[PDB]
């Protein structure tokens, strides 16, 4: 129910990550942006993080 004219003013100037229509683009673009922004992380978990 997030109408674009009702979102916070600081939010609209930034590309929001979509979790509504699927979790798929939710955590992916969370990590995809992290991969492009070189956010620090440790190891790759067990089983190569599955």
């Amino acid at each position: 129910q997030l109408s674009y004219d009702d979102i916070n003013i600081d939010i609209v100037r930034l590309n929001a990550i979509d979790f509504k229509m699927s979790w798929a683009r939710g955590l992916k673009d969370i990590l995809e942006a992290f991969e492009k922004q070189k956010v620090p992380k440790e190891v790759a978990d067990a089983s190569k993080s599955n």
Binding site: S22, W23, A46, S47, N50
Partner: protein, 459 residues
Amino acid sequence: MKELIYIEEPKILFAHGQKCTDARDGLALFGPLNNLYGIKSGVIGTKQGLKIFRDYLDHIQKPIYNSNSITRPMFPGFEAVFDCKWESTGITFKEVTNEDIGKFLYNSSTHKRTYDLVSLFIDKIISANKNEDENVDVWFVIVPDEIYKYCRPETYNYDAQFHDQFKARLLKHTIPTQIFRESTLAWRDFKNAFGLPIRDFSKIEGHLAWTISTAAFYKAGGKPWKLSDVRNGVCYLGLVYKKVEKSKNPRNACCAAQMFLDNGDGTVFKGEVGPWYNGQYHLEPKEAKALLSQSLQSYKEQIGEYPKEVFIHAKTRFNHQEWDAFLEVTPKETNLVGVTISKTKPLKLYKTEGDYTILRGNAYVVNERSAFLWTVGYVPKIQTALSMEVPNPLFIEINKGEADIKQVLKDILSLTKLNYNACIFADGEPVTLRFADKIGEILTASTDIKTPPLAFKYY
């Protein structure tokens, strides 16, 4: 020159709204929809049927890695995946000593011994159910490999395999018992003569432990997953004419119909029994007014109206003398689309490149009242076909009635994920036929129970 029309594969919902397509990974990252506080583990077996659980039961709490997680994925553990407490607590070890078993196993009359072996098990289970204090949610009968090695093919007509009689005798008690085996639960310590065990369950110890955990999960009232495309007010019926060639009279051939409804409450039930065998897998008109009515009585009182459409699946086509009775019992507001599904038609296509089968979801329509659905085959999710060659695409025909064949094709591609017995991408035939068959194997073995529409958990 002919083409193969494609329909998209529907997905399956999970915990707090999230909707993935694979049941393998949509459950690990999300968890089951309906959370339950804990499952009490009741186990009965021999001396070797207990230390195996004392190995396995807490083994799936910790994550275990297979050879490769891409093809045989690991699971973080029961608490981390299924959001429940299931450990060595509430254990109801009820030792049936081998000498006690041997004193009943030593009998050679398999027509009598096989019934006797189950009678040793049920009498304890119902006693604990009624005349005891301990509470068990799902019972784990760990029958050793020797018990079902020999007992394999009024109270003796049941099959040589004790699978049917054991579960059919609890219909009076309605306790959900998960039949187990030593081989399926003790893969590590079982070794053959040459040094290579026959059952190579090591790599499957991922999604196999998914099956055991999810089978014990749903039987406790839980909801591991639900379909995210099942339409509203629509009933998906399925009857498999199961042979009642268990007693001395072969005059009985009773089907076990069942339904998978919109709300996720698939109330699998019992059909009607009557003298129609001549070897014809059809039921007389008088009994038809008792099956579909009981099917619809169980739903009209539940929701308050008639179903929108009844997808009556079957491996056997419906004759007019059978379908005519269906007309008066059902209202005209629902179109009874009898989808005779056949897996014996000889259609097999191969690809000029690639060692895999055709991508699933393809629906090669033949005419307005025929189709060919590759519900079994290659997939883009697990990138592995659920078969070894291209199977028969499930011949889908509106045997009686008129409707859009395309609307029919998607729902069969939807009744393939809700397999609350395994952990696969999907099934090759609709669950409206597999779960309608497990009733027949269990229920029709015994002919002295006027059973309610018990769900699959009791079977």
